[PDB]
């Protein structure tokens, strides 16, 4: 019942981690850059307030999703973001 | 363009601020509990998954706003908070 504080990527990423109703998730913020994420189960992401872009393995192209917009990605995999403004974002395994 | 770490209430609300487009945002966790927090500007706060019951400074009443629900806290004010189960919010100046 703590909140667990995270840093990655010299500080580019932030997160703060909670259970929620005994679901684990994360709330956090992304400075603009490029990032790569692995995934062991699956994941969904929402945008809170921004906007991130995303590329899963073995996709040709990369998607836009902006605030209030979710996305899942596949376990056992990975994804690409590109973040062009700083951006909140709140990750479940739902 | 860096994102400002803080800890409140012996680690009962931690948040992450950030810049986005000029404006400062900031998002964050509250543990079950109850919180007093005071205002000078104006506050929108959005819950992004959980609820926050609300009782502004002189409301009779206290309301329940759950994920994706916001409200505003006049500035030069105050408001407290009950939260029920571990919490992510947004919080703006807007």
Known sequence: ASIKENS????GV?????NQHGQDVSVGVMLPGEYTFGTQAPERMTVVKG???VKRVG??????????ESFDVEGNSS???????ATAYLCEYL
């Open 14 to 18: 932030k997160s703060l981690g909670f």
């Open 59 to 68: 996709e040709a192209d990369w998607t836009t999703y902006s605030s209030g």
């Open 8 to 11: 990655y990527f010299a500080g």
């Open 79 to 85: 994804f690409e973001l590109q973040v062009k403004d």
């Open 51 to 53: 906007a991130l872009v």
